[PDB]
Amino acid sequence: DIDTAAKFIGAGAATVGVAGSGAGIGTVFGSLIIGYARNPSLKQQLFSYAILGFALSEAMGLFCLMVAFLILFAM
Amino acid sequence: MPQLNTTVWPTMITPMLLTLFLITQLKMLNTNYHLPPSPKPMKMKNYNKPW
């Protein structure tokens, strides 16, 4: 059906939006590497922020996948 | 999507409201941290030598 078809298309489209989270975690962990290479005494503390940074990047990524499934199954 | 089943929402809301605001808060309130023992080796109200 055209409905089911458009569900598949919109699912793939909404899935595209995970590239943002991919690049976001890339940047976060790259910056963590640099910041640790500079001031290693703060490693522990720095790591904390990293996780938090990560925890929000994946956040947005999640929303994408959300619509994906919320179109694939709930609609 | 089962999350959207608005029929069974209160059976999730109520026990959470009970355990997050009453039980857990109590189990915390029982956990107390006494101030550290501070034996004061300087406390002596000795009046001026009588004189």
From Swiss-Prot, chain A:
Site label Reversibly protonated during proton transport, positions: E58
Localisation per UniProt entry: Mitochondrion membrane
Topology in the lipid bilayer: Multi-pass membrane protein
Subunit relationships: Homooctamer; the c-ring consists of eight c subunits forming a circle, and each subunit adopts a hairpin shape. Component of the ATP synthase complex composed at least of ATP5F1A/subunit alpha, ATP5F1B/subunit beta, ATP5MC1/subunit c (homooctomer), MT-ATP6/subunit a, MT-ATP8/subunit 8, ATP5ME/subunit e, ATP5MF/subunit f, ATP5MG/subunit g, ATP5MK/subunit k, ATP5MJ/subunit j, ATP5F1C/subunit gamma, ATP5F1D/subunit delta, ATP5F1E/subunit epsilon, ATP5PF/subunit F6, ATP5PB/subunit b, ATP5PD/subunit d, ATP5PO/subunit OSCP.
Note: There are three genes which encode the mitochondrial ATP synthase proteolipid and they specify precursors with different import sequences but identical mature proteins. Is the major protein stored in the storage bodies of animals or humans affected with ceroid lipofuscinosis (Batten disease).
Family per similarity comment: Belongs to the ATPase C chain family.
Protein name: ATP synthase F(0) complex subunit C1, mitochondrial
The organism of origin for this protein: Homo sapiens (Human)
Upper classification of the organism: Eukaryota, Metazoa, Chordata, Craniata, Vertebrata
From Swiss-Prot, chain B:
An annotated Gene Ontology molecular function: proton transmembrane transporter activity
Keyword Transmembrane helix: yes
Gene name in the database record: MT-ATP8
Disulphide-bonded residues: none
Mode of membrane association: Single-pass membrane protein
Keyword Transport among UniProt keywords: yes
A cellular component annotation (GO) from this entry: mitochondrial inner membrane
Purpose of the protein: Subunit 8, of the mitochondrial membrane ATP synthase complex (F(1)F(0) ATP synthase or Complex V) that produces ATP from ADP in the presence of a proton gradient across the membrane which is generated by electron transport complexes of the respiratory chain. ATP synthase complex consist of a soluble F(1) head domain - the catalytic core - and a membrane F(1) domain - the membrane proton channel. These two domains are linked by a central stalk rotating inside the F(1) region and a stationary peripheral stalk.
GO biological process, one term: proton motive force-driven ATP synthesis
Protein name per Swiss-Prot or TrEMBL: ATP synthase F(0) complex subunit 8
Disease: Mitochondrial complex V deficiency, mitochondrial 2: A mitochondrial disorder with heterogeneous clinical manifestations including neuropathy, ataxia, hypertrophic cardiomyopathy. Hypertrophic cardiomyopathy can present with negligible to extreme hypertrophy, minimal to extensive fibrosis and myocyte disarray, absent to severe left ventricular outflow tract obstruction, and distinct septal contours/morphologies with extremely varying clinical course. Cardiomyopathy, infantile hypertrophic: An infantile form of hypertrophic cardiomyopathy, a heart disorder characterized by ventricular hypertrophy, which is usually asymmetric and often involves the interventricular septum. The symptoms include dyspnea, syncope, collapse, palpitations, and chest pain. They can be readily provoked by exercise. The disorder has inter- and intrafamilial variability ranging from benign to malignant forms with high risk of cardiac failure and sudden cardiac death.
UniProt subunit comment: Component of the ATP synthase complex composed at least of ATP5F1A/subunit alpha, ATP5F1B/subunit beta, ATP5MC1/subunit c (homooctomer), MT-ATP6/subunit a, MT-ATP8/subunit 8, ATP5ME/subunit e, ATP5MF/subunit f, ATP5MG/subunit g, ATP5MK/subunit k, ATP5MJ/subunit j, ATP5F1C/subunit gamma, ATP5F1D/subunit delta, ATP5F1E/subunit epsilon, ATP5PF/subunit F6, ATP5PB/subunit b, ATP5PD/subunit d, ATP5PO/subunit OSCP.
Record's subcellular location: Mitochondrion membrane
Transmembrane segments: 8-21
Organism in which the protein naturally occurs: Homo sapiens (Human)
Keywords from the named record: Acetylation, ATP synthesis, Cardiomyopathy, CF(0), Disease variant, Hydrogen ion transport, Ion transport, Membrane, Mitochondrion, Primary mitochondrial disease, Transmembrane, Transmembrane helix, Transport
Family affiliation: Belongs to the ATPase protein 8 family.
Top-level taxon in the UniProt lineage: Eukaryota
Residue span relative to the full protein: 1 to 51 of 68
Annotated signal sequence range: none
